[PDB]
Amino acid sequence: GSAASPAVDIGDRLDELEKALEALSAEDGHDDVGQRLESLLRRWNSRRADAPSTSAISED
Amino acid sequence: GSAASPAVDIGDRLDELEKALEALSAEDGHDDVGQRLESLLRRWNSRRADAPSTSAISED
């Protein structure tokens, strides 16, 4: 019943994360949010690259 | 009563984001995720830089 489960459109979390930083926008050296935001993306992109060659068609 | 409010420890958003992503791990060219992921930071890191010189002491 309780709201949860990942893959929540993926954009939902991203949007909420942004709205949060909007308020936490370097309010007091929030570099921590940067390392997190960055680490997520580094791992995110890294996984993207990890894939056997076949076509790699550009997203429409 | 309903759970909300930003800056929820911030990494709380992020954490869930990665977990989400872990699901969307290049599941179907979720390049949109990284676009958001990046946008977040480029907006995040940028604001960080936006600050008058005074000391800029490195985080412990």
From Swiss-Prot, chains A, B:
It comes from the Bacteria. Disruption phenotype: Cells lacking this gene are unable to produce 6-deoxyerythronolide (6-dEB), however a tetraketide lactone shunt is produced. Disulfide bonds: none annotated. Homodimer. Erythronolide synthase is composed of EryAI, EryAII and EryAIII multimodular (2 modules) polypeptides each coding for a functional synthase subunit which participates in 2 of the six FAS-like elongation steps required for formation of the polyketide. Module 1, 2, 3, 4, 5, and 6 participating in biosynthesis steps 1, 2, 3, 4, 5, and 6, respectively. Type I modular polyketide synthases (PKSs) catalyze the step-wise condensation of simple carboxylic acid derivatives. Organizationally, type I PKSs are arranged into modules, wherein each module is comprised of a set of catalytic activities that is responsible for a single elongation of the polyketide chain and the appropriate reductive processing of the beta-keto functionality. A minimal elongation module contains an acyl transferase (AT) domain, an acyl-carrier protein (ACP) domain, and a ketosynthase (KS) domain. Involved in the biosynthesis of antibiotic erythromycin via the biosynthesis of its aglycone precursor, 6-deoxyerythronolide B (6-dEB). This is Erythronolide synthase EryA2. The lineage of its organism: Bacteria, Bacillati, Actinomycetota, Actinomycetes, Pseudonocardiales.
